[PDB]
Design an enzyme around this catalytic site. Structure first.
Site, PDB file in Angstrom:
ATOM      1  N   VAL A   8      -2.128  -9.874   9.583  1.00 14.13           N
ATOM      2  CA  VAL A   8      -1.656  -9.559   8.399  1.00 14.13           C
ATOM      3  C   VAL A   8      -0.319  -8.736   8.448  1.00 14.13           C
ATOM      4  O   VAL A   8       0.467  -8.595   7.258  1.00 14.13           O
ATOM      5  CB  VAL A   8      -2.600  -8.742   7.386  1.00 14.13           C
ATOM      6  CG1 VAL A   8      -4.023  -9.676   7.239  1.00 14.13           C
ATOM      7  CG2 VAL A   8      -2.816  -7.275   7.868  1.00 14.13           C
ATOM      8  N   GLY A   9       0.287  -8.320   9.404  1.00 10.23           N
ATOM      9  CA  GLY A   9       1.344  -7.682   9.571  1.00 10.23           C
ATOM     10  C   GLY A   9       1.788  -7.255  10.975  1.00 10.23           C
ATOM     11  O   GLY A   9       0.772  -6.908  11.811  1.00 10.23           O
ATOM     12  N   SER A  10       3.103  -7.126  11.512  1.00  6.49           N
ATOM     13  CA  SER A  10       4.042  -6.538  12.698  1.00  6.49           C
ATOM     14  C   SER A  10       4.990  -5.977  12.382  1.00  6.49           C
ATOM     15  O   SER A  10       5.796  -6.111  11.276  1.00  6.49           O
ATOM     16  CB  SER A  10       3.982  -8.045  13.447  1.00  6.49           C
ATOM     17  OG  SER A  10       4.321  -7.557  14.750  1.00  6.49           O
ATOM     18  N   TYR A  44       6.165  -0.502  15.346  1.00  6.79           N
ATOM     19  CA  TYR A  44       5.347   0.615  15.524  1.00  6.79           C
ATOM     20  C   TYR A  44       3.915   0.020  15.779  1.00  6.79           C
ATOM     21  O   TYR A  44       2.949   0.754  16.465  1.00  6.79           O
ATOM     22  CB  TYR A  44       5.203   1.840  14.466  1.00  6.79           C
ATOM     23  CG  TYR A  44       6.560   2.420  14.555  1.00  6.79           C
ATOM     24  CD1 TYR A  44       6.990   2.871  15.607  1.00  6.79           C
ATOM     25  CD2 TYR A  44       6.853   3.061  13.237  1.00  6.79           C
ATOM     26  CE1 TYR A  44       8.370   3.862  15.403  1.00  6.79           C
ATOM     27  CE2 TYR A  44       8.073   3.817  13.163  1.00  6.79           C
ATOM     28  CZ  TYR A  44       8.772   4.247  14.178  1.00  6.79           C
ATOM     29  OH  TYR A  44       9.940   5.056  14.312  1.00  6.79           O
ATOM     30  N   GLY A  45       3.726  -1.214  15.412  1.00 14.50           N
ATOM     31  CA  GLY A  45       2.279  -1.683  15.409  1.00 14.50           C
ATOM     32  C   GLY A  45       2.278  -3.073  15.165  1.00 14.50           C
ATOM     33  O   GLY A  45       3.140  -3.766  14.429  1.00 14.50           O
ATOM     34  N   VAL A  52      -1.051  -5.372  12.759  1.00 17.48           N
ATOM     35  CA  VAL A  52      -2.156  -5.186  11.847  1.00 17.48           C
ATOM     36  C   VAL A  52      -2.966  -6.664  11.757  1.00 17.48           C
ATOM     37  O   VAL A  52      -2.231  -7.490  11.536  1.00 17.48           O
ATOM     38  CB  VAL A  52      -2.067  -4.433  10.574  1.00 17.48           C
ATOM     39  CG1 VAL A  52      -3.067  -4.262   9.583  1.00 17.48           C
ATOM     40  CG2 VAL A  52      -1.001  -3.360  10.712  1.00 17.48           C
ATOM     41  N   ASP A 102       0.652   4.787   4.235  1.00 14.46           N
ATOM     42  CA  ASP A 102       1.745   4.494   4.825  1.00 14.46           C
ATOM     43  C   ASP A 102       1.633   3.355   5.615  1.00 14.46           C
ATOM     44  O   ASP A 102       1.221   3.357   6.644  1.00 14.46           O
ATOM     45  CB  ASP A 102       2.246   5.655   5.391  1.00 14.46           C
ATOM     46  CG  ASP A 102       3.954   5.518   5.772  1.00 14.46           C
ATOM     47  OD1 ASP A 102       4.332   4.350   5.809  1.00 14.46           O
ATOM     48  OD2 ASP A 102       4.724   6.659   6.248  1.00 14.46           O
TER      49      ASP A 102
END
Ligand SMILES: CC(=O)Nc1cn2cc(-c3cc(NC(=O)c4cccc(C(F)(F)F)c4)ccc3C)ccc2n1
Length: 350
Positions: free
Chosen positions: A27-29, A32-33, A35, A165
């Site tokens: 769902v996201g990149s 920092y990481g 998801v 956040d």
């Protein structure tokens, strides 16, 4: 009592998670990481699993990792993101390299709500009330959010809101350059590095969000730092002698004094048709001098929230020890502290 972990490659990243987390989907990149959305078979919840990117590569990264874990483990409020789980596939400190953080999967954010739906005054009252209820809790732990914006506010179908956040990248100069939402909600003291800022930087952001819920439009959509400052000063007025003395940067102070003096605008003429109580609250939040800005606790008591305000149901946080912020440690020491926090994690009840 260690669960069984299984491995899978998701977008060139190896994920190793307990078997309870199924149907992992990206769902996201960012820096920092990464998801993934997942189904927690143990709780029946739709979750978001964040795998931190190289959490102990440097002292800075190791400290940031420890910082985020401490903060997430502390937050226990209806209007603030909560940690459902934290795990590592590592069996010992020696093999410890990866950290995964699990929260509720968020549906819409405040940006999705303002997009096609024009918000009514009662809807605005409820949404801002919850932001301030969550901020009162965050601030009572001496935590400054620093990045409150519509994309960091999750709102469910019943208009129930959580402060989060969801940022995955480094908050660099480039990311804050130009016509960008990353800078439109920032307090001028933090945006221009005027002085050592306090938690009212977050109240400026709430004021910016509230104005946008009321008009459907960005309050200060600056094309750059200076154009945004000019949009701010046109509304709130140029600073007086009292505020200029508080600007510790001589360079920034000298620049402001070069601008043509402007009075504060009439907010009733800016926010046409808005509830006069909303206008009044906005004038107390959008104050240039951060020392004179209304706090979250003072704002919950404002007459604009009469319909929701319950002083017996606006809790403060437990004491939060952040003595670690001024500690100079090696990567392995920040790592061992992180490890103790992962293994000591107690999940919340159903
Ligand atoms: C569709 C969808 O649900 N997408 C989605 C869900 N996501 C969830 C996360 C996520 C975020 C954190 N950290 C924080 O929220 C955080 C950090 C510091 C301070 C505070 C505050 F408390 F000060 F706000 C809050 C931890 C773990 C996860 C899994 C990141 C991106 C994301 N994308």
């Amino acid at each position: 009592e260690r669960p069984t972990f299984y491995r899978q490659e998701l977008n060139k990243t190896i994920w190793e998670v307990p078997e309870r987390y199924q149907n992992l989907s990206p769902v996201g990149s960012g820096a920092y990481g990464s998801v993934c959305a997942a189904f927690d078979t143990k709780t029946g919840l739709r979750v978001a699993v964040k795998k931190l990117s190289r959490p102990f590569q440097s002292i800075i990264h190791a400290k940031r990792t420890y910082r985020e874990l401490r903060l997430l483990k502390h937050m226990k409020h209806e209007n603030v993101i909560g940690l459902l789980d934290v795990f590592t596939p590592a069996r010992s400190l020696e093999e410890f390299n990866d950290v995964y953080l699990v929260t509720h999967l968020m549906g819409a954010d405040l940006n999705n709500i303002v997009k096609c739906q024009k918000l009514t005054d009662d809807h605005v009252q409820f949404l801002i009330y919850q932001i301030l209820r969550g901020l009162k809790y965050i601030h009572s732990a001496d935590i400054i959010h620093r990045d409150l914006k519509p994309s960091n506010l999750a709102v469910n179908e019943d208009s129930e809101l959580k402060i989060l956040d969801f940022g995955l990248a480094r908050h660099t100069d480039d990311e804050m350059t130009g016509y960008v939402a990353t800078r439109w909600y920032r307090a001028p003291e933090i945006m221009l590095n005027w002085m050592h800022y306090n938690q009212t930087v977050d109240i400026w952001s709430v004021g910016c969000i509230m104005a946008e819920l009321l008009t459907g439009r960005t309050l200060f959509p600056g094309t750059d730092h200076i154009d945004q400052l000019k949009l701010i000063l046109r509304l709130v007025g140029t600073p007086g002698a009292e505020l200029l003395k508080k600007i510790s940067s001589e360079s920034a102070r000298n620049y402001i004094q070069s601008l043509t003096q402007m009075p504060k605008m009439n907010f009733a003429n800016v926010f046409i048709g808005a509830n006069p109580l909303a206008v009044d609250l906005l004038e107390k939040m959008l104050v240039l001098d951060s020392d004179k800005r209304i706090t979250a606790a003072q704002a919950l008591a404002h007459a604009y929230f009469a319909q929701y305000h319950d002083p017996d149901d606006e809790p403060v946080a437990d004491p939060y020890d952040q003595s670690f912020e001024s500690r100079d440690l090696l990567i392995d020491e920040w790592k061992s502290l992180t490890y103790d926090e992962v293994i000591s994690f107690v999940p919340p009840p159903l």
